[PDB]
Amino acid sequence: VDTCSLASPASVCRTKHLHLRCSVDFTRRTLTGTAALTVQSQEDNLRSLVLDTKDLTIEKVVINGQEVKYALGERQSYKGSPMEISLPIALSKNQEIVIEISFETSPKSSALQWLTPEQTSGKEHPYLFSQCQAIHCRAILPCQDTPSVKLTYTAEVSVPKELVALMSAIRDGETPDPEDPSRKIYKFIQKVPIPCYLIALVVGALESRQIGPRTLVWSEKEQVEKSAYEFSETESMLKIAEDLGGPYVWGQYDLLVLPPSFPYGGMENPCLTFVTPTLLAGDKSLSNVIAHEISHSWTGNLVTNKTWDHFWLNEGHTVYLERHICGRLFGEKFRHFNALGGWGELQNSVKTFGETHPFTKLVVDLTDIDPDVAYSSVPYEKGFALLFYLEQLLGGPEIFLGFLKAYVEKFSYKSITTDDWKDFLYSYFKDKVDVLNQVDWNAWLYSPGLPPIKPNYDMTLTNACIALSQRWITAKEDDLNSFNATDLKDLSSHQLNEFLAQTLQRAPLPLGHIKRMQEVYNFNAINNSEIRFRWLRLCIQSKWEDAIPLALKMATEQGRMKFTRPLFKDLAAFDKSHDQAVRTYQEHKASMHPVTAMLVGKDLKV
Ligand SMILES: c1ccc(Cc2ccc(OC[C@H]3CCCN3)cc2)cc1
Ligand SMILES: [Yb+3]
Ligand SMILES: [Yb+3]
Ligand SMILES: [Zn+2]
């Protein structure tokens, strides 16, 4: 059972389909309409069921054409309020009925960010986007808000006629709205069963450009050309992913480039991946995020974690596939470079939480924990590290990719636990059980801290990064003259980033060192978001007051939490910028994404 959901579990009843009919009201910042849930009883004599809700106003519940009794329980913090519905006729096992709930969202919906025209590229029209993962779908519509249940869906969405609606589904046409000529209705169909966290909606002044046989990129007009170029490797990556994972079942693979406040690098919404505009580096160098989102089309969207305690199944396997895609495109030495960088990020995460912290376990226990507070690189990188270690134990990448494909095929359209995964690993590799039994399963799956063993990494591309980082760390004042722009001449953007990551792991450095780094490398000029993030962190941690306005600007001009949270935290930790950091958060809080505002507030103790 799912300790993050208040709804009836899958063992009691299962939602098979959602038909959503709604209207997006920008004047009120509300979504209003009806959610018709087709529900299948899993029990004899079923007379009631419970759904998740969060800050929803319920008008009525209709079954068999008549209003029925319901009750909203008390709010249980971030979990929201349970909604018990009294069924008019007792159901037999496997009987299906349709329950139509009339509802309206709150402007404060934690699933939604409502943007004013000023907050968009075009400055004329407003914009709305959703982000349900993990447990925010209940803040859009009443549902069994657990990934243990998979449903198909159809939707009709009425929007102001100058705007476009898109969803995690196949577009099924548009018409003027008969109830309001100032509006358009956009229709959508998702015929593959999905967990509700994958329900997504965007409304805005959107344009599209074709970039491959099954891919359009969508954004505001101002970003279309740059996005088409940035993500032009998409089809090549989809082809490799199909080779590794099996058939792509979702029809199209479109991309949507969101406004800068989108809180994450990407979200693998089926048919329509959402990405941060912080990927728009100009040189395709941050395309691994696209590889990651593509990979979720198998690991996550087809094979799904049964509860959020098992989130590493989604992420570890996706990072594993991501790094294989990038290895195929750019070589095995590059895969190792990225794998080793990932271990570095895991080191950082473990150090941040502390080596005994429960959020550093691979399988977590989210009982009475807000999923958004637990979120970190751990499931990604500790999960990847386990799979990479197993690859090395079991005879290499060709062999292990055989397992991955078989795993996806075995559990397609299902929701599974860590034990399901482990049982299948043992089944697939039955002739290697002696090797499998050498793994310290209790440590890897259930213990906090760094894994009990570190995999073997090729160091070829990393060596120059470490060498230069070490030169800086061990430099004394009289060595600073020796550094020069030529030091960087043979380093790729990825290597510059890794040099900064290595150096940040030892921060602070002396202020004069950091001043010299700017003098000779001109890192202030680099617009690549990953590099700029790490550089500004290094500058702030090393107490360079000149970097304060730069870091405040980056923290607020975009909202990807990977960057915004640590920049604010670093600015708060620096005495010279502390008061400004707090004031800046206070001033921006009302117009921030609701989850980002919550987490930055928590980080700052404000
Ligand atoms: C370990 C850490 C967090 C969680 C809960 C969780 C899972 C996914 C989440 O997704 C949020 C963003 C990540 C990228 C797009 N969605 C958030 C919280 C479970 C295990
Ligand atoms: Yb159609
Ligand atoms: Yb010296
Ligand atoms: Zn992911």
PDB file of N, CA, C and O in Angstrom, residues 457-516:
ATOM      1  N   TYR A 457      35.477   2.864 -13.106  1.00  0.00           N
ATOM      2  CA  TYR A 457      35.255   3.870 -14.141  1.00  0.00           C
ATOM      3  C   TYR A 457      36.514   4.121 -14.952  1.00  0.00           C
ATOM      4  O   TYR A 457      37.587   4.339 -14.382  1.00  0.00           O
ATOM      5  N   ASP A 458      36.375   4.108 -16.279  1.00  0.00           N
ATOM      6  CA  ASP A 458      37.409   4.641 -17.164  1.00  0.00           C
ATOM      7  C   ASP A 458      37.570   6.127 -16.842  1.00  0.00           C
ATOM      8  O   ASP A 458      36.578   6.844 -16.670  1.00  0.00           O
ATOM      9  N   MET A 459      38.824   6.558 -16.740  1.00  0.00           N
ATOM     10  CA  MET A 459      39.165   7.904 -16.287  1.00  0.00           C
ATOM     11  C   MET A 459      39.631   8.825 -17.394  1.00  0.00           C
ATOM     12  O   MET A 459      39.962   9.984 -17.120  1.00  0.00           O
ATOM     13  N   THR A 460      39.689   8.316 -18.626  1.00  0.00           N
ATOM     14  CA  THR A 460      40.326   9.041 -19.730  1.00  0.00           C
ATOM     15  C   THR A 460      39.923  10.524 -19.829  1.00  0.00           C
ATOM     16  O   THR A 460      40.790  11.412 -19.806  1.00  0.00           O
ATOM     17  N   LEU A 461      38.621  10.796 -19.931  1.00  0.00           N
ATOM     18  CA  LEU A 461      38.137  12.164 -20.104  1.00  0.00           C
ATOM     19  C   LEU A 461      38.119  12.966 -18.799  1.00  0.00           C
ATOM     20  O   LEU A 461      38.029  14.189 -18.826  1.00  0.00           O
ATOM     21  N   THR A 462      38.203  12.273 -17.670  1.00  0.00           N
ATOM     22  CA  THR A 462      38.139  12.935 -16.377  1.00  0.00           C
ATOM     23  C   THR A 462      39.501  13.443 -15.937  1.00  0.00           C
ATOM     24  O   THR A 462      39.584  14.438 -15.205  1.00  0.00           O
ATOM     25  N   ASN A 463      40.560  12.768 -16.386  1.00  0.00           N
ATOM     26  CA  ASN A 463      41.917  13.047 -15.885  1.00  0.00           C
ATOM     27  C   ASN A 463      42.332  14.523 -15.966  1.00  0.00           C
ATOM     28  O   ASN A 463      42.848  15.080 -14.985  1.00  0.00           O
ATOM     29  N   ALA A 464      42.105  15.158 -17.119  1.00  0.00           N
ATOM     30  CA  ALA A 464      42.469  16.567 -17.307  1.00  0.00           C
ATOM     31  C   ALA A 464      41.715  17.495 -16.351  1.00  0.00           C
ATOM     32  O   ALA A 464      42.246  18.535 -15.934  1.00  0.00           O
ATOM     33  N   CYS A 465      40.474  17.122 -16.035  1.00  0.00           N
ATOM     34  CA  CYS A 465      39.616  17.913 -15.150  1.00  0.00           C
ATOM     35  C   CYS A 465      40.162  17.882 -13.739  1.00  0.00           C
ATOM     36  O   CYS A 465      40.259  18.921 -13.070  1.00  0.00           O
ATOM     37  N   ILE A 466      40.483  16.678 -13.286  1.00  0.00           N
ATOM     38  CA  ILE A 466      41.055  16.484 -11.949  1.00  0.00           C
ATOM     39  C   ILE A 466      42.414  17.182 -11.848  1.00  0.00           C
ATOM     40  O   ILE A 466      42.702  17.856 -10.861  1.00  0.00           O
ATOM     41  N   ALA A 467      43.230  17.041 -12.886  1.00  0.00           N
ATOM     42  CA  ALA A 467      44.574  17.616 -12.866  1.00  0.00           C
ATOM     43  C   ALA A 467      44.529  19.124 -12.731  1.00  0.00           C
ATOM     44  O   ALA A 467      45.295  19.708 -11.934  1.00  0.00           O
ATOM     45  N   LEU A 468      43.628  19.768 -13.484  1.00  0.00           N
ATOM     46  CA  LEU A 468      43.538  21.221 -13.425  1.00  0.00           C
ATOM     47  C   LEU A 468      42.936  21.678 -12.093  1.00  0.00           C
ATOM     48  O   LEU A 468      43.406  22.638 -11.485  1.00  0.00           O
ATOM     49  N   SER A 469      41.934  20.947 -11.612  1.00  0.00           N
ATOM     50  CA  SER A 469      41.332  21.271 -10.331  1.00  0.00           C
ATOM     51  C   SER A 469      42.385  21.213  -9.227  1.00  0.00           C
ATOM     52  O   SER A 469      42.478  22.122  -8.400  1.00  0.00           O
ATOM     53  N   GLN A 470      43.182  20.155  -9.242  1.00  0.00           N
ATOM     54  CA  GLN A 470      44.257  19.989  -8.267  1.00  0.00           C
ATOM     55  C   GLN A 470      45.319  21.087  -8.355  1.00  0.00           C
ATOM     56  O   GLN A 470      45.831  21.529  -7.324  1.00  0.00           O
ATOM     57  N   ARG A 471      45.645  21.533  -9.567  1.00  0.00           N
ATOM     58  CA  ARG A 471      46.594  22.638  -9.721  1.00  0.00           C
ATOM     59  C   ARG A 471      46.073  23.868  -8.995  1.00  0.00           C
ATOM     60  O   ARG A 471      46.827  24.563  -8.312  1.00  0.00           O
ATOM     61  N   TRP A 472      44.779  24.144  -9.144  1.00  0.00           N
ATOM     62  CA  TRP A 472      44.200  25.306  -8.491  1.00  0.00           C
ATOM     63  C   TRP A 472      44.165  25.157  -6.971  1.00  0.00           C
ATOM     64  O   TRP A 472      44.495  26.100  -6.250  1.00  0.00           O
ATOM     65  N   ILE A 473      43.740  23.992  -6.493  1.00  0.00           N
ATOM     66  CA  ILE A 473      43.596  23.782  -5.061  1.00  0.00           C
ATOM     67  C   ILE A 473      44.937  23.873  -4.332  1.00  0.00           C
ATOM     68  O   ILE A 473      45.019  24.465  -3.242  1.00  0.00           O
ATOM     69  N   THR A 474      45.989  23.356  -4.966  1.00  0.00           N
ATOM     70  CA  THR A 474      47.322  23.311  -4.357  1.00  0.00           C
ATOM     71  C   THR A 474      48.139  24.560  -4.671  1.00  0.00           C
ATOM     72  O   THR A 474      49.241  24.729  -4.118  1.00  0.00           O
ATOM     73  N   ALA A 475      47.616  25.429  -5.539  1.00  0.00           N
ATOM     74  CA  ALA A 475      48.312  26.683  -5.877  1.00  0.00           C
ATOM     75  C   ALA A 475      48.421  27.602  -4.670  1.00  0.00           C
ATOM     76  O   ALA A 475      47.473  27.744  -3.892  1.00  0.00           O
ATOM     77  N   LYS A 476      49.580  28.235  -4.517  1.00  0.00           N
ATOM     78  CA  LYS A 476      49.735  29.327  -3.568  1.00  0.00           C
ATOM     79  C   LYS A 476      49.754  30.630  -4.379  1.00  0.00           C
ATOM     80  O   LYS A 476      49.718  30.595  -5.621  1.00  0.00           O
ATOM     81  N   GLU A 477      49.781  31.777  -3.702  1.00  0.00           N
ATOM     82  CA  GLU A 477      49.695  33.056  -4.400  1.00  0.00           C
ATOM     83  C   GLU A 477      50.700  33.162  -5.547  1.00  0.00           C
ATOM     84  O   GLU A 477      50.351  33.659  -6.627  1.00  0.00           O
ATOM     85  N   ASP A 478      51.932  32.713  -5.310  1.00  0.00           N
ATOM     86  CA  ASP A 478      52.974  32.850  -6.343  1.00  0.00           C
ATOM     87  C   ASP A 478      52.821  31.918  -7.554  1.00  0.00           C
ATOM     88  O   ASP A 478      53.585  32.020  -8.525  1.00  0.00           O
ATOM     89  N   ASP A 479      51.836  31.018  -7.495  1.00  0.00           N
ATOM     90  CA  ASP A 479      51.543  30.096  -8.588  1.00  0.00           C
ATOM     91  C   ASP A 479      50.430  30.628  -9.489  1.00  0.00           C
ATOM     92  O   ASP A 479      50.209  30.109 -10.588  1.00  0.00           O
ATOM     93  N   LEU A 480      49.722  31.654  -9.024  1.00  0.00           N
ATOM     94  CA  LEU A 480      48.543  32.124  -9.748  1.00  0.00           C
ATOM     95  C   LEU A 480      48.920  32.669 -11.135  1.00  0.00           C
ATOM     96  O   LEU A 480      48.171  32.512 -12.097  1.00  0.00           O
ATOM     97  N   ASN A 481      50.110  33.257 -11.243  1.00  0.00           N
ATOM     98  CA  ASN A 481      50.561  33.804 -12.526  1.00  0.00           C
ATOM     99  C   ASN A 481      50.620  32.746 -13.626  1.00  0.00           C
ATOM    100  O   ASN A 481      50.475  33.069 -14.825  1.00  0.00           O
ATOM    101  N   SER A 482      50.847  31.496 -13.228  1.00  0.00           N
ATOM    102  CA  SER A 482      51.073  30.407 -14.182  1.00  0.00           C
ATOM    103  C   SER A 482      49.807  30.038 -14.950  1.00  0.00           C
ATOM    104  O   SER A 482      49.882  29.535 -16.062  1.00  0.00           O
ATOM    105  N   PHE A 483      48.646  30.309 -14.368  1.00  0.00           N
ATOM    106  CA  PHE A 483      47.393  29.976 -15.044  1.00  0.00           C
ATOM    107  C   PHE A 483      47.125  30.927 -16.205  1.00  0.00           C
ATOM    108  O   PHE A 483      47.506  32.095 -16.167  1.00  0.00           O
ATOM    109  N   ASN A 484      46.470  30.397 -17.238  1.00  0.00           N
ATOM    110  CA  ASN A 484      46.273  31.115 -18.492  1.00  0.00           C
ATOM    111  C   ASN A 484      45.111  30.487 -19.250  1.00  0.00           C
ATOM    112  O   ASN A 484      44.821  29.301 -19.060  1.00  0.00           O
ATOM    113  N   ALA A 485      44.472  31.268 -20.118  1.00  0.00           N
ATOM    114  CA  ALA A 485      43.343  30.779 -20.930  1.00  0.00           C
ATOM    115  C   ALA A 485      43.662  29.503 -21.704  1.00  0.00           C
ATOM    116  O   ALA A 485      42.761  28.682 -21.973  1.00  0.00           O
ATOM    117  N   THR A 486      44.938  29.317 -22.047  1.00  0.00           N
ATOM    118  CA  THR A 486      45.367  28.108 -22.770  1.00  0.00           C
ATOM    119  C   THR A 486      45.139  26.822 -21.972  1.00  0.00           C
ATOM    120  O   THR A 486      45.061  25.738 -22.548  1.00  0.00           O
ATOM    121  N   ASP A 487      45.012  26.940 -20.643  1.00  0.00           N
ATOM    122  CA  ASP A 487      44.739  25.768 -19.803  1.00  0.00           C
ATOM    123  C   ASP A 487      43.466  25.035 -20.248  1.00  0.00           C
ATOM    124  O   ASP A 487      43.313  23.847 -19.972  1.00  0.00           O
ATOM    125  N   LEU A 488      42.557  25.768 -20.892  1.00  0.00           N
ATOM    126  CA  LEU A 488      41.211  25.260 -21.220  1.00  0.00           C
ATOM    127  C   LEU A 488      41.075  24.823 -22.668  1.00  0.00           C
ATOM    128  O   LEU A 488      40.006  24.357 -23.087  1.00  0.00           O
ATOM    129  N   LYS A 489      42.151  24.974 -23.431  1.00  0.00           N
ATOM    130  CA  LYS A 489      42.053  24.878 -24.887  1.00  0.00           C
ATOM    131  C   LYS A 489      41.592  23.497 -25.379  1.00  0.00           C
ATOM    132  O   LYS A 489      40.935  23.412 -26.413  1.00  0.00           O
ATOM    133  N   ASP A 490      41.923  22.435 -24.640  1.00  0.00           N
ATOM    134  CA  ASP A 490      41.544  21.078 -25.027  1.00  0.00           C
ATOM    135  C   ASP A 490      40.387  20.509 -24.185  1.00  0.00           C
ATOM    136  O   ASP A 490      40.150  19.297 -24.177  1.00  0.00           O
ATOM    137  N   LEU A 491      39.666  21.381 -23.493  1.00  0.00           N
ATOM    138  CA  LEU A 491      38.558  20.922 -22.643  1.00  0.00           C
ATOM    139  C   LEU A 491      37.213  21.219 -23.297  1.00  0.00           C
ATOM    140  O   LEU A 491      36.961  22.347 -23.743  1.00  0.00           O
ATOM    141  N   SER A 492      36.352  20.209 -23.353  1.00  0.00           N
ATOM    142  CA  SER A 492      34.998  20.406 -23.865  1.00  0.00           C
ATOM    143  C   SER A 492      34.179  21.132 -22.806  1.00  0.00           C
ATOM    144  O   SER A 492      34.611  21.253 -21.659  1.00  0.00           O
ATOM    145  N   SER A 493      32.993  21.596 -23.183  1.00  0.00           N
ATOM    146  CA  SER A 493      32.086  22.183 -22.194  1.00  0.00           C
ATOM    147  C   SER A 493      31.843  21.219 -21.026  1.00  0.00           C
ATOM    148  O   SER A 493      31.799  21.659 -19.864  1.00  0.00           O
ATOM    149  N   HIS A 494      31.718  19.921 -21.328  1.00  0.00           N
ATOM    150  CA  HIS A 494      31.466  18.887 -20.302  1.00  0.00           C
ATOM    151  C   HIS A 494      32.637  18.811 -19.342  1.00  0.00           C
ATOM    152  O   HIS A 494      32.469  18.661 -18.124  1.00  0.00           O
ATOM    153  N   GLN A 495      33.834  18.945 -19.893  1.00  0.00           N
ATOM    154  CA  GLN A 495      35.036  18.915 -19.064  1.00  0.00           C
ATOM    155  C   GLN A 495      35.220  20.180 -18.241  1.00  0.00           C
ATOM    156  O   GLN A 495      35.687  20.101 -17.106  1.00  0.00           O
ATOM    157  N   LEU A 496      34.873  21.341 -18.805  1.00  0.00           N
ATOM    158  CA  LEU A 496      34.884  22.590 -18.021  1.00  0.00           C
ATOM    159  C   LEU A 496      33.944  22.443 -16.829  1.00  0.00           C
ATOM    160  O   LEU A 496      34.291  22.803 -15.701  1.00  0.00           O
ATOM    161  N   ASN A 497      32.767  21.884 -17.081  1.00  0.00           N
ATOM    162  CA  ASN A 497      31.781  21.674 -16.029  1.00  0.00           C
ATOM    163  C   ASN A 497      32.317  20.745 -14.941  1.00  0.00           C
ATOM    164  O   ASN A 497      32.156  20.998 -13.740  1.00  0.00           O
ATOM    165  N   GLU A 498      32.976  19.673 -15.360  1.00  0.00           N
ATOM    166  CA  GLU A 498      33.533  18.729 -14.412  1.00  0.00           C
ATOM    167  C   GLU A 498      34.707  19.323 -13.624  1.00  0.00           C
ATOM    168  O   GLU A 498      34.833  19.051 -12.425  1.00  0.00           O
ATOM    169  N   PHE A 499      35.548  20.124 -14.283  1.00  0.00           N
ATOM    170  CA  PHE A 499      36.612  20.872 -13.578  1.00  0.00           C
ATOM    171  C   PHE A 499      35.994  21.725 -12.452  1.00  0.00           C
ATOM    172  O   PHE A 499      36.488  21.736 -11.313  1.00  0.00           O
ATOM    173  N   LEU A 500      34.906  22.417 -12.768  1.00  0.00           N
ATOM    174  CA  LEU A 500      34.236  23.237 -11.755  1.00  0.00           C
ATOM    175  C   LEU A 500      33.608  22.375 -10.677  1.00  0.00           C
ATOM    176  O   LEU A 500      33.675  22.731  -9.505  1.00  0.00           O
ATOM    177  N   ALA A 501      32.998  21.245 -11.057  1.00  0.00           N
ATOM    178  CA  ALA A 501      32.419  20.337 -10.067  1.00  0.00           C
ATOM    179  C   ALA A 501      33.474  19.797  -9.105  1.00  0.00           C
ATOM    180  O   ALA A 501      33.263  19.796  -7.889  1.00  0.00           O
ATOM    181  N   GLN A 502      34.624  19.398  -9.643  1.00  0.00           N
ATOM    182  CA  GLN A 502      35.744  18.910  -8.815  1.00  0.00           C
ATOM    183  C   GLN A 502      36.197  19.999  -7.842  1.00  0.00           C
ATOM    184  O   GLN A 502      36.430  19.743  -6.662  1.00  0.00           O
ATOM    185  N   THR A 503      36.296  21.221  -8.343  1.00  0.00           N
ATOM    186  CA  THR A 503      36.808  22.335  -7.525  1.00  0.00           C
ATOM    187  C   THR A 503      35.791  22.759  -6.457  1.00  0.00           C
ATOM    188  O   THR A 503      36.163  23.077  -5.318  1.00  0.00           O
ATOM    189  N   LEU A 504      34.513  22.741  -6.823  1.00  0.00           N
ATOM    190  CA  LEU A 504      33.444  23.075  -5.888  1.00  0.00           C
ATOM    191  C   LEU A 504      33.400  22.102  -4.707  1.00  0.00           C
ATOM    192  O   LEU A 504      33.085  22.507  -3.585  1.00  0.00           O
ATOM    193  N   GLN A 505      33.759  20.842  -4.951  1.00  0.00           N
ATOM    194  CA  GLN A 505      33.832  19.842  -3.879  1.00  0.00           C
ATOM    195  C   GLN A 505      34.843  20.208  -2.790  1.00  0.00           C
ATOM    196  O   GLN A 505      34.767  19.654  -1.690  1.00  0.00           O
ATOM    197  N   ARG A 506      35.773  21.124  -3.096  1.00  0.00           N
ATOM    198  CA  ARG A 506      36.787  21.583  -2.120  1.00  0.00           C
ATOM    199  C   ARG A 506      36.582  23.036  -1.677  1.00  0.00           C
ATOM    200  O   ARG A 506      37.424  23.613  -0.968  1.00  0.00           O
ATOM    201  N   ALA A 507      35.466  23.637  -2.080  1.00  0.00           N
ATOM    202  CA  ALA A 507      35.206  25.036  -1.774  1.00  0.00           C
ATOM    203  C   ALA A 507      34.965  25.236  -0.274  1.00  0.00           C
ATOM    204  O   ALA A 507      34.446  24.334   0.395  1.00  0.00           O
ATOM    205  N   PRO A 508      35.341  26.407   0.256  1.00  0.00           N
ATOM    206  CA  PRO A 508      35.890  27.573  -0.459  1.00  0.00           C
ATOM    207  C   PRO A 508      37.343  27.424  -0.868  1.00  0.00           C
ATOM    208  O   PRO A 508      38.100  26.651  -0.254  1.00  0.00           O
ATOM    209  N   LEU A 509      37.704  28.155  -1.918  1.00  0.00           N
ATOM    210  CA  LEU A 509      39.091  28.405  -2.270  1.00  0.00           C
ATOM    211  C   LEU A 509      39.393  29.845  -1.857  1.00  0.00           C
ATOM    212  O   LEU A 509      38.472  30.613  -1.568  1.00  0.00           O
ATOM    213  N   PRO A 510      40.686  30.211  -1.781  1.00  0.00           N
ATOM    214  CA  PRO A 510      40.999  31.589  -1.431  1.00  0.00           C
ATOM    215  C   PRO A 510      40.383  32.575  -2.427  1.00  0.00           C
ATOM    216  O   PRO A 510      40.326  32.295  -3.634  1.00  0.00           O
ATOM    217  N   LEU A 511      39.917  33.709  -1.921  1.00  0.00           N
ATOM    218  CA  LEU A 511      39.317  34.735  -2.776  1.00  0.00           C
ATOM    219  C   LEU A 511      40.210  35.153  -3.948  1.00  0.00           C
ATOM    220  O   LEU A 511      39.731  35.268  -5.076  1.00  0.00           O
ATOM    221  N   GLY A 512      41.503  35.341  -3.696  1.00  0.00           N
ATOM    222  CA  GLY A 512      42.433  35.686  -4.780  1.00  0.00           C
ATOM    223  C   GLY A 512      42.503  34.632  -5.880  1.00  0.00           C
ATOM    224  O   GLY A 512      42.739  34.967  -7.036  1.00  0.00           O
ATOM    225  N   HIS A 513      42.331  33.353  -5.533  1.00  0.00           N
ATOM    226  CA  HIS A 513      42.313  32.291  -6.548  1.00  0.00           C
ATOM    227  C   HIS A 513      41.120  32.445  -7.481  1.00  0.00           C
ATOM    228  O   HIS A 513      41.244  32.375  -8.710  1.00  0.00           O
ATOM    229  N   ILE A 514      39.958  32.672  -6.883  1.00  0.00           N
ATOM    230  CA  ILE A 514      38.733  32.814  -7.645  1.00  0.00           C
ATOM    231  C   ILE A 514      38.768  34.073  -8.520  1.00  0.00           C
ATOM    232  O   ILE A 514      38.332  34.038  -9.664  1.00  0.00           O
ATOM    233  N   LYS A 515      39.329  35.160  -7.995  1.00  0.00           N
ATOM    234  CA  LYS A 515      39.517  36.372  -8.795  1.00  0.00           C
ATOM    235  C   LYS A 515      40.429  36.083  -9.988  1.00  0.00           C
ATOM    236  O   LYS A 515      40.128  36.507 -11.114  1.00  0.00           O
ATOM    237  N   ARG A 516      41.510  35.336  -9.759  1.00  0.00           N
ATOM    238  CA  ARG A 516      42.403  34.956 -10.862  1.00  0.00           C
ATOM    239  C   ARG A 516      41.713  34.071 -11.902  1.00  0.00           C
ATOM    240  O   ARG A 516      41.941  34.228 -13.096  1.00  0.00           O
TER     241      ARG A 516
END
